[PDB]
């Protein structure tokens, strides 16, 4: 029996393929708009959304055309991750590029922080899904993910915080709203990964990725508008 929920995360997708597509849209044909010396932080931008994009198109063929449950198949995990792998430097970047060898050791530490997170998640899914349940190893993973997360946010909120001071107030306050998103808005994947971890189930599953769907589009083009406001209105 054809069923509901799949034809609703069906369409989702493709919101999220369009909202993504339209973010990458604005944020190129805006570029030109900016001081030579801030269209990195629009390009940056679209290339996050892009990358989304790309994965939204591509779960069209997870869930399939058919509305049933058991047809669900493909593999979405991975095609999550290796968005999630390339697009969360590419945000986390945007801090040290609204500040300016002096941004460098903290991109740094943010970079290797973030990839321990994401490839943390990766192994510990993949243990899940493998057996179908609960795994130690899921659980352990996760731990040490959140572990480089809570790095993460301890650096914006010291590190990024303090150097926003030296930075003109609508950079400045740019990068303190930004910070939340990392705090916040961040803070539903790994929310999501812990009913998978307790949880098991098809239509769970369905319900965290329409979920993810509304981050993503609050994380990549929400975070990216955020930026982009700032360095067009210190363009004048
Ligand atoms: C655009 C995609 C975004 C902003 C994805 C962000 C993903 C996370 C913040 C992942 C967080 C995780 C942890 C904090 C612990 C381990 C499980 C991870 C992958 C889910
Ligand atoms: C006038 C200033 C010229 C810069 C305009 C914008 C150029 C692009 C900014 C950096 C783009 C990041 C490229 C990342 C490639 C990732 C491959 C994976
Ligand atoms: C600049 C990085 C570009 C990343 C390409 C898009 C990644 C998301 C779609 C992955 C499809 C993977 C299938 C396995
Ligand atoms: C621009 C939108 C492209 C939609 C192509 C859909 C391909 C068939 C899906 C099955
Ligand atoms: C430098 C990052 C290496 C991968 C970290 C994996 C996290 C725990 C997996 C077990
Ligand atoms: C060159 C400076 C490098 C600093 C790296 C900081 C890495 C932070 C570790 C992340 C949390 C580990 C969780 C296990
Ligand atoms: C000013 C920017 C604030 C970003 C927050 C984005 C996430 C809001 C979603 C509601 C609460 C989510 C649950 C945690
Ligand atoms: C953040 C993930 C929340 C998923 C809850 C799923 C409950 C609906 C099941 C039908
Ligand atoms: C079957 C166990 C019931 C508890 C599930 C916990 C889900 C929320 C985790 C946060």
């Not at 945000?91 to 060898?101: A, M």
């Not at 002096?102 to 991109?107: D, F, I, S, V």
């Not at 731990?143 to 150097?163: D, E, Q, R, S």
């Amino acid at each position: 029996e054809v069923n509901l929920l799949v034809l609703a995360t069906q369409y989702m997708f493709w919101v999220g393929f369009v909202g993504m597509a339209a973010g990458t849209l604005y944020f190129l044909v805006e570029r030109n708009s900016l001081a030579p010396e801030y269209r990195s932080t629009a390009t940056v931008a679209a290339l996050v959304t892009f990358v989304a994009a790309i994965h939204y198109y591509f779960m069209k063929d997870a869930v399939g055309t058919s509305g049933l449950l058991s047809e669900i198949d493909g593999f979405p995990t991975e095609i999550r991750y290796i968005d999630w792998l390339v697009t969360t430097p590419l945000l986390l970047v945007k801090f040290p590029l609204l500040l300016g060898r002096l941004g460098r050791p903290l991109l740094t530490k943010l970079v290797i922080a973030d990839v321990i997170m994401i490839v943390g998640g990766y192994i510990g899914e993949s243990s899940i899904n493998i057996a179908g349940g609960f795994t130690q190893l899921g659980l352990w993973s996760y731990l040490i993910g959140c572990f480089a997360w809570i790095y993460i946010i301890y650096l914006l909120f010291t590190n990024v915080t303090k150097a926003a001071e030296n930075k003109p107030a609508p950079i400045r306050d740019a990068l303190l709203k930004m910070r939340l998103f990392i705090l916040i808005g961040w803070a539903i994947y790994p929310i999501g990964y812990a009913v998978t971890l307790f949880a098991p189930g098809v239509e769970i599953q369905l319900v965290r990725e329409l979920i993810y769907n509304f981050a993503d589009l609050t994380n990549k083009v929400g975070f990216g508008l955020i930026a982009f406001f700032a360095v067009k209105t210190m363009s004048s």
